[PDB]
Amino acid sequence: FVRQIQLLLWKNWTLRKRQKIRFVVELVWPLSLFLVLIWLRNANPLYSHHECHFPNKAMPSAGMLPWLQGIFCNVNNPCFQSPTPGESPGIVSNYNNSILARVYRDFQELLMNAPESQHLGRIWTELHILSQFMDTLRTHPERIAGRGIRIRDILKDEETLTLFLIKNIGLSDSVVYLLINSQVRPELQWIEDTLYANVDFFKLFRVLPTLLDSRSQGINLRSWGGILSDMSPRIQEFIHRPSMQDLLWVTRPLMQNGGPETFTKLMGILSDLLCGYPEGGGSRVLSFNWYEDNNYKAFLGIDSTRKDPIYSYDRRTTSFCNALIQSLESNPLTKIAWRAAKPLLMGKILYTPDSPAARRILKNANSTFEELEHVRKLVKAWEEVGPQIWYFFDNSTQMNMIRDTLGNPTVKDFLNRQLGEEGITAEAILNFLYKGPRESQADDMANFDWRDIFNITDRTLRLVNQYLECLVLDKFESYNDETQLTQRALSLLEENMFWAGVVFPDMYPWTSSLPPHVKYKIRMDIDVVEKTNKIKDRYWDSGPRADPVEDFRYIWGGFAYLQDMVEQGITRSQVQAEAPVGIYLQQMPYPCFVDDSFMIILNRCFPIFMVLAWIYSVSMTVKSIVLEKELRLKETLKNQGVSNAVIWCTWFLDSFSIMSMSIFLLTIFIMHGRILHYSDPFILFLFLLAFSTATIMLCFLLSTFFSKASLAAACSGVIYFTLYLPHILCFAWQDRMTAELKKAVSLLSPVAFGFGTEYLVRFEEQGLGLQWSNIGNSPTEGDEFSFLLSMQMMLLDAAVYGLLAWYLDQVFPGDYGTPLPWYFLNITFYENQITAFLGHNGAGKTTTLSILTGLLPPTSGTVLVGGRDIETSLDAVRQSLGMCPQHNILFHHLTVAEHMLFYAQLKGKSQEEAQLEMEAMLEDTGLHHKRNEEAQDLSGGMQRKLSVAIAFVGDAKVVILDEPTSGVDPYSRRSIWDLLLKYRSGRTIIMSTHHMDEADLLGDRIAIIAQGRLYCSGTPLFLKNCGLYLTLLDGDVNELMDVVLHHVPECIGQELIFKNFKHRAYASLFRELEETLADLGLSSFGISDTPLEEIFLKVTGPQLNTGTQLVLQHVQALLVKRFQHTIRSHKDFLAQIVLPATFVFLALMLSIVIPPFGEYPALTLHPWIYGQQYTFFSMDEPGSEQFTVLADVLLNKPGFGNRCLKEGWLPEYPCGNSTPWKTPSVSPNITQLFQKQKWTQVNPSPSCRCSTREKLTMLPECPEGAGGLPPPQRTQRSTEILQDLTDRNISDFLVKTYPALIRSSLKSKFWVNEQRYGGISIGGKLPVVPITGEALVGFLSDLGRIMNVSGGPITREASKEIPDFLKHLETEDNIKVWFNNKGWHALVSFLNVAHNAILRASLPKDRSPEEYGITVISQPLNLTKEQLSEITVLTTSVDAVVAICVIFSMSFVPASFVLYLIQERVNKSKHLQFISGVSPTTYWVTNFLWDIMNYSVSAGLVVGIFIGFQKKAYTSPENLPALVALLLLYGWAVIPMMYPASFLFDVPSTAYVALSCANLFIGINSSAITFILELFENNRTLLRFNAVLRKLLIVFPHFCLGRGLIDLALSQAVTDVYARFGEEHSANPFHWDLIGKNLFAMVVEGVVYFLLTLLVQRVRPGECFGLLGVNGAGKTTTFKMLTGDTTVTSGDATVAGKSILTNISEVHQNMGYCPQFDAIDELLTGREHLYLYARLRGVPAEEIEKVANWSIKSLGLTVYADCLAGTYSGGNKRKLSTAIALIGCPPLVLLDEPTTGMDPQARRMLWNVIVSIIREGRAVVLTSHSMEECEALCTRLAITIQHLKSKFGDGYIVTMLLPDLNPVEQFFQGNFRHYNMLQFQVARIFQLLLSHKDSLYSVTQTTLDQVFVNF
Ligand SMILES: CCCCCCCC/C=C\CCCCCCCC(=O)O[C@@H](COC(=O)CCCCCCC/C=C/CCCCCCCC)COP(=O)(O)OCC\N=C/C=C(C)\C=C\C=C(C)/C=C\C1=C(C)CCCC1(C)C
Ligand SMILES: *[C@@H]1O[C@H](CO)[C@@H](O)[C@H](O)[C@H]1NC(C)=O
Ligand SMILES: *[C@@H]1O[C@H](CO)[C@@H](O)[C@H](O)[C@H]1NC(C)=O
Ligand SMILES: *[C@@H]1O[C@H](CO)[C@@H](O)[C@H](O)[C@H]1NC(C)=O
Ligand SMILES: *[C@@H]1O[C@H](CO)[C@@H](O)[C@H](O)[C@H]1NC(C)=O
Ligand SMILES: [Mg+2]
């Protein structure tokens, strides 16, 4: 039966290709969402970074110098691709390439390790010291061997020349002594100088300056000269070394009046001066996960900076310090860094107990601050040592002696021993003592001397002293309890002088001795510490989480530093021993990650968008199927011979074709839009095609539930969207499913699509992206769901949906034969001419018809020559065809020629045969001229003509019909008669209807036998004889009637009514009547024969109220009506009482499930806050006993942390058992790889291949090697696995095994256990200076003894504790604490672990380390008002979403009202009420009143729901009336707002969906815009915001309600905030500033919209007039003009009798033309027996409680009177409509189409009621399209029944074996075709022929049917 598929598919394609709006939308709308996705993809570029190795971070326990150097160097936390030096096992110092370190290295290499130069330098040192000692006069304490007491010796004073001299024989004093005395003296004399005795310059003899030291021998030799010129080559090599040259080249801008960049270039110089990091100084990685901190300001671009503090005058600092603070805070450039650094530099630390134990702990922790104070004192000592240096370089006596030695004749070696050694001798005179005391002029000092550098060094020292004085080093303030703290801390945070509060619990103010286990809490500001309510990063981000400022609050906030200080103080308090070990937190290395945030969107937006891509489409598909079912058109196909599965097969082919085109376009769009980079387009195409197939099965399944096309189209999209939501619910609980409950949930197609696209996103994060070889593999490596199973089970869902849809369609059809069980006498009449079976409906005629249809199986009878339809179902289905039912069976959009082709090819035939048949159109249907016209374009007569002609498209021998012309136009009835007669073809045509006139002329070979038992055969000749009436204002015809009655032996007004033919008597009466016609007033004459309808009948105060008594009664009636309509209807109950209730309940669930945003409790800060993890251990320096015992007390005895304390640490964390050491088993080829190949230290293991710029992977693909040879494991007693990373490359192992660890964890990427958060490397020795302090003090004292600089109080105070300063400057023994920053509280917890290990290692022999420990707790202080503002913003955003949901829920009830109103308006029920006498004002007022009542009930229910939650924001006593007012007034204002939607729209379900969408859109926009634009505190949009709030959006009641709820939430939040702070709040609604504005706006807007709605609203007494003068003219327009439906004045002048106006009755408009029953059932279809009550209580007018008395209106039908109006059939419905139309006894009765399809008996009852009414004296005017009903019901008035026939061209019709007909024809021709019946069209000859009947029958005049103005 493939031809059926082909034909139905062609039909479906032809209908689909003509809509031209669904076609384009179904292809464009899905593309728009993915264009949005493309834009999002372009707006979210991926962030890729290389391998990250981070520099070591020192701690205060490691000494001031490493700690500060780390602080300065690692301000950016740089990423180095190569491992840092600190990551090596034995070394910790990354400052190896710094210029200072290299200069120090060269200093040791050349000077310290010189060739025994130390000995020579020392010898020179004691040489100078001995010379200085000899320089001292020491009064007379001299050896007296030589006259050298004092004053440059006294040789002249004491010698042999004293007194008279002459001791040496002939000694003379300046008298040219012949003999010179030399025995008593160590060394031509005359008065004149330069003589023979004065030949020597100074002293020729005794040139040695030693002079045996003048005491105890020890003469100073030339050892100083020997050392001289030996230091010169080494000094030159040191100076010319590249390190020293680099030092000079970088230091030139420094220490000068330069600094071109005040801070940018200074940092650049200081970096390579102190840090010297490789690469370009490293690079920082940026943390983009702003949503993890709830930092909405960062996303929106708001500044998010706290308010600046006040100047606070000067405080206790210096003027320079205050100026610096004010400049730093005021400068916008440097206020952020200064804000971060101020608590550290100048802040206070507060401790609560104030106990002797606490004071001891803090004194021990003070070490860093004593060290800083010592540095400050050392710098301050310059103030009193600098002038001494300057004076020493002034005269003094040492510098003068040096100058004299240089000033000696030739200065011994004038050119120096090291001649030409780049050093001039004048450098000892100038540039060292230039110009003596002072320079002669500016720049005359050779520009470089002692003072030239003295100013620069003095200025630098004084400036650094000034800067250092701006520091607070007495940071510890003692309080009494934690209540006094957090109050001082609040003020300090206000002025930014608070570091932390170190509160010690479990210890009283009098506690002196420390407990073995010490707990303490560090209380920080929440802005400088990680939040304690969250420990992980939620959504796992590919990245190291290593932004220096964004996610290192523990470092730069001072938490880690203070924790280290406090724990070190506790350690020193407990152990009472010197075991100095530092801490070197070192972040774990990270591999080549790729951060693609767009995947998040792709993980959430891709499914929903796809669903939203089909919503409209799915609706249309359903709108097709139900449209084939509601139009009784699927049953037409089933009668035609479809299989009930070929139709759905073709529906699939059509829908699948359109969806396949759409999916092809979407796949091309996605691939070329770079939404998916690394995916094969074919698998994505197949995934989308499987989703499409599941969607089409959803369409088929949903089409069975519904029976109305419009409702199905409106609601199918709603079900389709709703079905996806379970996926959203399951995504939050993704870990809950165990691949079995997930399967159960995924029976829904959207949920399975969501799972599949989740797997797609997971594969797209990698470089694979759903290839053919990985669809069946789950990337999580632990889930059995996979992705291929997703597509397969979506196909399974499609099959299940289709099967269940087929089952339901078979079992629950619309109206047809249904197999409820779970399956999965009689003869033939004449066979020629147009036979007609006439009978009452339901009396067996329909049963005989159905038996003849073939539907009911034939029993003991033959439908045709085939024997039986039961015996031969295939036969008599092609010939016995053309089944024309009462329903018009056509297509909405298909063409007439297309109908002909489709129906000709459906019943056999072929395309050529169908085309040939369509060519023979047999005229009609506009011939071939109207071929291109669509079926809907054709008029009703044309539509029915085509429907009947469709029966003759195929060659059909038997064409049985059912009312071909039941309600067709009279001209159209003639046309259909001509078409049907022209297609007789000798066929057994059978037609059945209640219209006998249709069988009068076109009916031949009549057989009215369907009477239930075939009582009468009813052949036309036989039916004729089962008498004739005579037709002819004078009023005297009563006497004339007797004459005619006597001549030929039912009278009414304006007319005359009165075998065995009696020709002689009849002809005599006819001649007498014709002769007397002139005398009488009759204009014409006629003859009436026996009607065919009668043949079938053979078997069968004032009562009226006036004035104000109306309106009140009016409203009651209307109220009552709607009351009934809201009791019978249950849809109006679910759409008004529960739907808002359920949505509000869901919204409140959402509100209460969200956790509070500002809890921040105390966190115990231990590594086991993360459950299962690997912690690693490295042992370096095994020789040290201290490190061995530290490893012992770290590994097994107490273990890590404090979980094992021998006395119970935490009940929630018990201690288990420790497994023995075990190296994990490894694959054989891994060992082969590691043994066969060569691996060096630089390349110890295979390298992970990360992103290659063309295949970007989230993490590198690590080969089988990775770290390699897994380390031994222990499964520590703390239920955590310890790895032994001893003698192994820790950095390589970590960075290459991290991906393997994290692949297992990231099964969901929502709460990941990285299984590795920290580790300990016990080792790393920092080289220290060998000065040892005391030697330095001795050297400085000796130097100060050489020249009397001495010192003062400051120098002595500085020198008191130099050895302690040197000891605390740096720490030699150290331990590294590796931490993973992706765990937030990781580094602090492992500081705690390391300090516990250090404390346990230092314990004495006794006092077992099991019990000792330290516990750190992070408990942030109470939030400030600025932070509480953000918390309030978050909470009120949740409340705003709740308010939006409340608006959306409450908008349903007014929508239900609008659907009621539109349903009442469309079916003209509202117009009927207006016609009866309901004024528009009264109608709208009572509708508004009832709507307010219903909404009040619904809002009371919603208020009950709210109060059931005890929400303080809304349900508090001061807010409950507010919430009630908001709800009630919102409804009361929004109901009139959408009243006009009744006029705008015409379809109820469409109105519901459109109004719900509009309300949701308006509500979300109104709430969100005002809630978001108010967040921008400092902007120019605020005015814009106000232009949105006060004026723009206040018009919408949605905005009023939403802003009211939001403002209530904000007011309650701020009231709670002030109550927490104790300031209290007014909290008074109805103030016009909080909520009163919205209430007044609602009050005004309700009235305004109600007025807008009211503005939108803007014949003789006894003769029936048949208003059918022109059929083509719009009589419906005339009736509307006579009624209130149309106000067009372009019409004829008419009056209602009582009043005359433009609208006839416009002058009065009261109780005029009361009935207006048109060709429409103006029934509410929900009220029973109340129509006669509603249409009488006051609606026509109040009849004074006479409702029961006026029960006569129930004469037509009393059995169905008490049943629902929609419950019973159309005949009873229209009988009730007519009864309520003429219920008020009006003078004028309007009737349109007086009787539609109804039983002839009921039609007779209606006609007798009408004629009785018109005889009573009530005027009736009637119109009809059948026009057969006008006869015998309407009076002489017509648009004269006999007069019209006579005036128009017409005449009487005369009707009379085979040879016997010849005499009749010959006789008939004498006076003036079919077998046994002659139809001759034709007065004197007629009378004569009647008398001559024997020589040769019934004769009737022209009827109203014949010649109905054909023109
Ligand atoms: C104009 C654009 C130009 C620039 C281009 C950028 C455009 C691209 C758009 C984004 C580029 C980057 C992609 C990041 C977002 C894209 C992800 C997406 O699209 O879907 C999300 C929707 O999730 C939700 O919104 C609530 C569910 C959270 C459940 C947590 C449970 C407990 C927490 C409850 C607190 C909830 C507060 C109440 C929320 C009220 C509703 C807003 C599914 O999150 P996920 O878990 O699947 O992924 C992990 C992400 N982690 C947290 C996600 C968010 C959004 C945190 C927002 C945090 C906030 C404060 C959101 C909104 C804000 C609040 C409420 C008040 C201030 C105003 C503001 C609107 C800014
Ligand atoms: C400083 O030296 C000068 C130079 O001779 C000399 O007057 C004296 O030693 C000092 N000057 C004083 C003390 O004014
Ligand atoms: C090593 O052996 C394992 C399992 O025996 C296998 O999966 C892997 O592919 C092998 N590798 C090589 C290089 O043979
Ligand atoms: C050093 O001693 C000299 C004399 O020997 C004296 O003039 C000078 O003031 C001293 N310097 C001091 C005490 O700083
Ligand atoms: C901090 O908040 C707690 C929470 O209950 C409160 O008890 C305490 O008094 C607050 N301290 C202040 C506001 O100083
Ligand atoms: Mg972050």
What would the two tokens of residue 827 be?
Answer: 């003869």
| Ligand 2 site-directed mutation target among 390, 395, 402, 438, most atoms within 8 Å of CB | 395
What would the two tokens of residue 1553 be?
Answer: 């969906």
Going by CA atoms, what residue is nearest to atom 39 of ligand 1? Answer: 1438
* Residues in a beta bridge with 1461: none
Q: 1707 — phi, psi (to 5°)?
A: -70, -35
What would the two tokens of residue 691 be?
Answer: 């989703």
* Residues in a beta bridge with 1821: 1665, 1790
Instruction: Identify which of 100, 586, 572, 104 has the alpha carbon closest to the alpha carbon of residue 368.
Output: 572
Instruction: Identify which of 1614, 532, 1609 has the alpha carbon closest to the alpha carbon of residue 1151.
Output: 1609
User: Could you give the count of Cα atoms lying within 13 Å of 36 in the half-sphere of its Cβ?
Assistant: 14
Q: How many residues are given for the chain? A: 1911
Neighbours of 1130 (CB within 10 A): 9
| Atom number of ligand 1 nearest to Cα 296 | 71
| Atom number of ligand 4 nearest to Cα 388 | 14
Instruction: Identify which of 589, 285, 594 has the alpha carbon closest to the alpha carbon of residue 1255.
Output: 594
Distances (CA, A) of 1101 to 343, 1505, 1743: 97, 53, 11
Cβ atoms 1697, 1661 nearer than 8 A: no
User: Could you give the count of Cα atoms lying within 13 Å of 581 in the half-sphere of its Cβ?
Assistant: 26
Q: What is the H or E stretch that residue 836 is in?
A: strand 834-836
What CA–CA distance (Å, rounded) separates 882 from 959? 6
Helix (H, G, I), strand (E, B) or coil at 451: helix
What CA–CA distance (Å, rounded) separates 1362 from 374? 8
Check if 1422 has its Cβ closer than 6 Å to any atom of ligand 5: yes
Per-residue DSSP letter, 1788:
E
Q: 1713-1717 and 1788-1792: which strand pairing?
A: parallel
| Ligand 3 site-directed mutation target among 1225, 1226, 1229, most atoms within 8 Å of CB | 1229
* Residues in a beta bridge with 520: 1416
The percent of the chain in helix, strand and coil, each rounded to the nearest 5, is 50, 5, 45
What CA–CA distance (Å, rounded) separates 1080 from 190? 202
| Atom number of ligand 2 nearest to Cα 436 | 4
Q: Who's near 1099: CB < 8 A, 6+ residues apart?
A: 1011, 1015, 1016
Going by CA atoms, what residue is nearest to atom 3 of ligand 2? Answer: 395
- DSSP codes of every residue in 197-252: TT-SSS-SS---S-GGGGSSS----THHHHHTTTHHHHHHHHHHSHHHHHHHHHHT
- Total H helices, total E strands in the chain: 66, 24
Distance 994 CA to ligand 5 centre (A): 91
What CA–CA distance (Å, rounded) separates 222 from 1455? 116
What CA–CA distance (Å, rounded) separates 684 from 679? 8
Cite the DSSP H helix spans in 272-422: 296-300, 319-330, 335-345, 356-365, 367-380, 382-393, 398-407
Instruction: Identify which of 777, 838, 866, 810 has the alpha carbon closest to the alpha carbon of residue 961.
Output: 838
Helix (H, G, I), strand (E, B) or coil at 661: helix
Check if 487 has its Cβ closer than 6 Å to any atom of ligand 5: yes
> Which ligand has the nearest atom to the CA of 1617?
5
What CA–CA distance (Å, rounded) separates 1559 from 1566? 10
Distance 1300 CA to ligand 3 centre (A): 17
What CA–CA distance (Å, rounded) separates 786 from 767? 18
What CA–CA distance (Å, rounded) separates 977 from 991? 12
Largest CA distance in the chain: 223
Going by CA atoms, what residue is nearest to atom 4 of ligand 5? Answer: 1422
Q: What is the H or E stretch that residue 1855 is in?
A: strand 1853-1855
Going by CA atoms, what residue is nearest to atom 12 of ligand 2? Answer: 395
Residue list, annotated binding site for Mg(2+): 287, 289, 846, 1676
What would the two tokens of residue 1221 be?
Answer: 């050491």
Q: Which CATH class is domain 1665-1839?
A: alpha beta
Architecture of domain 834-1004: 3-Layer(aba) Sandwich (3.40)
- 615-630 and 646-672 helices cross at what angle (nearest 10)? 170
Instruction: Identify which of 1371, 1174, 1266, 1376 has the alpha carbon closest to the alpha carbon of residue 89.
Output: 1376
> Which ligand has the nearest atom to the CA of 523?
5
Cβ atoms 581, 1325 nearer than 8 A: no
Cβ atoms 1790, 1696 nearer than 8 A: no
What would the two tokens of residue 1531 be?
Answer: 């409804």
Distance 741 CA to ligand 6 centre (A): 34
Cβ atoms 410, 388 nearer than 8 A: no
φ/ψ region of 190 (left if φ > 0, alpha if ψ in -120 to 50, else beta) reads: beta
Query: Given CA atoms 1106, 1108, 1111, 1113 in this order, what sign does their dihedral have?
Result: negative
Cβ atoms 1005, 834 nearer than 8 A: yes
Q: Which residue has the tokens 């006294």?
A: 154
Cβ atoms 1298, 588 nearer than 8 A: yes
What CA–CA distance (Å, rounded) separates 1246 from 754? 38
Distances (CA, A) of 1133 to 781, 1136, 1348, 1498: 51, 5, 107, 10
> Which ligand has the nearest atom to the CA of 391?
4
Q: 495 — phi, psi (to 5°)?
A: -100, 10
What CA–CA distance (Å, rounded) separates 426 from 441? 19
- DSSP codes of every residue in 103-154: HHHHIIIIIITSSSHHHHHHHHHHHHHHHHHHH---SS-S--SSS-SSSS--
Distances (CA, A) of 483 to 820, 1422, 1827: 79, 12, 100
Residue list, annotated binding site: 287, 289, 538, 604, 842, 845-847, 886, 930, 940-941, 994, 1671-1672, 1675-1677, 1770
Q: Which residue has the tokens 């959803």?
A: 698
What CA–CA distance (Å, rounded) separates 583 from 1371? 10
What would the two tokens of residue 1070 be?
Answer: 């006819």
Going by CA atoms, what residue is nearest to atom 13 of ligand 2? Answer: 395
What CA–CA distance (Å, rounded) separates 933 from 329? 83
Cβ atoms 765, 596 nearer than 8 A: yes
Instruction: Identify which of 1425, 1426, 1157 has the alpha carbon closest to the alpha carbon of residue 302.
Output: 1426
What CA–CA distance (Å, rounded) separates 754 from 607? 5
What would the two tokens of residue 327 be?
Answer: 């400049």
What CA–CA distance (Å, rounded) separates 52 from 1633? 55
Check if 1348 has its Cβ closer than 6 Å to any atom of ligand 4: yes
What CA–CA distance (Å, rounded) separates 690 from 915? 39
Cβ atoms 1420, 524 nearer than 8 A: yes
Residues in contact with ligand 2 by the CB-under-6-Å rule are 394-395
Cβ atoms 921, 927 nearer than 8 A: yes
> Which ligand has the nearest atom to the CA of 1162?
5
Check if 1606 has its Cβ closer than 6 Å to any atom of ligand 1: no
Per-residue DSSP letter, 1792:
E
* Residues in a beta bridge with 351: 478
Distance 137 CA to ligand 4 centre (A): 14
Indicate which technique resolved this structure. cryo-EM
Cβ atoms 996, 1095 nearer than 8 A: yes
Q: 1174-1179 and 1318-1322: which strand pairing?
A: parallel
Cβ atoms 479, 354 nearer than 8 A: yes
What would the two tokens of residue 841 be?
Answer: 């409906």
At residue 1904's C-alpha, the angle toward residues 1903 and 1905, to 5°, is 90
What would the two tokens of residue 1475 be?
Answer: 């016609």
Going by CA atoms, what residue is nearest to atom 8 of ligand 2? Answer: 395
Q: Order of strands, edge to edge, in the sheet holding 1879-1881?
A: 1879-1881, 1853-1855, 1898-1900
What would the two tokens of residue 1379 be?
Answer: 């931490």
Cβ atoms 1286, 1178 nearer than 8 A: yes
Q: 1374-1379 and 582-583: which strand pairing?
A: parallel
Reported resolution, Å: 2.9
Buried b or exposed e, range 70-101, using 16+ CB within 10 angstroms: bbebbbbbbbbeebbbbbbbebbbbbeebbbb
Instruction: Identify which of 763, 1549, 1613 has the alpha carbon closest to the alpha carbon of residue 1135.
Output: 1549
Q: 989-991 and 834-836: which strand pairing?
A: parallel
- DSSP codes of every residue in 1133-1174: HIIIIIHHHHHHHHHHHHHHHSPPS-----B---GGGSSS-E
Q: What is the CA radius of gyration of the chain?
A: 57
Q: Which residue has the tokens 């992977």?
A: 1257
Residue list, annotated binding site for ATP: 842, 845, 847, 886, 930, 940-941, 994, 1671-1672, 1675-1677, 1770
> Which ligand has the nearest atom to the CA of 540?
1
Cβ atoms 1403, 1199 nearer than 8 A: no
The set of long-range contacts for 11-15, using a CB threshold of 8 Å and a minimum separation of 24, is 11/650, 11/891, 11/894, 11/898, 11/902, 12/650, 12/651, 12/653, 12/654, 13/654, 13/657, 14/894, 14/895, 14/898, 15/891, 15/892, 15/893, 15/894
Going by CA atoms, what residue is nearest to atom 4 of ligand 3? Answer: 1227
Instruction: Identify which of 932, 1096, 922, 1084 has the alpha carbon closest to the alpha carbon of residue 1000.
Output: 1096
Q: 1318-1322 and 1374-1379: which strand pairing?
A: antiparallel
Instruction: Identify which of 1138, 1129, 1041 has the alpha carbon closest to the alpha carbon of residue 1080.
Output: 1041
* Residues in a beta bridge with 960: 990
Cβ atoms 794, 690 nearer than 8 A: yes
What would the two tokens of residue 1341 be?
Answer: 């004292």
Distance 1422 CA to ligand 5 centre (A): 7
Check if 395 has its Cβ closer than 6 Å to any atom of ligand 4: no
Q: 1665-1666 and 1819-1823: which strand pairing?
A: parallel
* Residues in a beta bridge with 1086: 1031
Q: 1769 — phi, psi (to 5°)?
A: -75, 175
Query: Given CA atoms 1586, 1588, 1590, 1592 in this order, what sign does their dihedral have?
Result: positive
